[PDB]
Amino acid sequence: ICCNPACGPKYSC
C-alpha cells in the first residue's frame, strides 16, 4: 500500500 498522494496509482490508504 501507499498512504501518499505522490503514490497516485500506488495510493492505497
Integer Rg of the chain from CA: 5
Please give, one letter per residue, the 3-state secondary structure of 1-13: CCCCHHHHHHCCC
Q: Please say whether the beta carbons of 11 and 2 come within 8 A.
A: yes
13 contact partners, CB below 8 Å, separation of at least 6: 1, 2, 3, 4
Q: What was the elucidation method?
A: NMR
Can you tell me the distance from the alpha carbon of 4 to that of 8, in angstroms, rounded to the nearest whole number? 8
2 contact partners, CB below 8 Å, separation of at least 6: 10, 11, 12, 13
Cα atoms in the 13 Å half-sphere on the side-chain side of 12: 4
* Grid cell listed for 3: 498512504
Instruction: Tell me if residue 7 falls in helix, strand or coil.
Output: helix
**Which residues of the chain form beta strands (DSSP E)?**
none
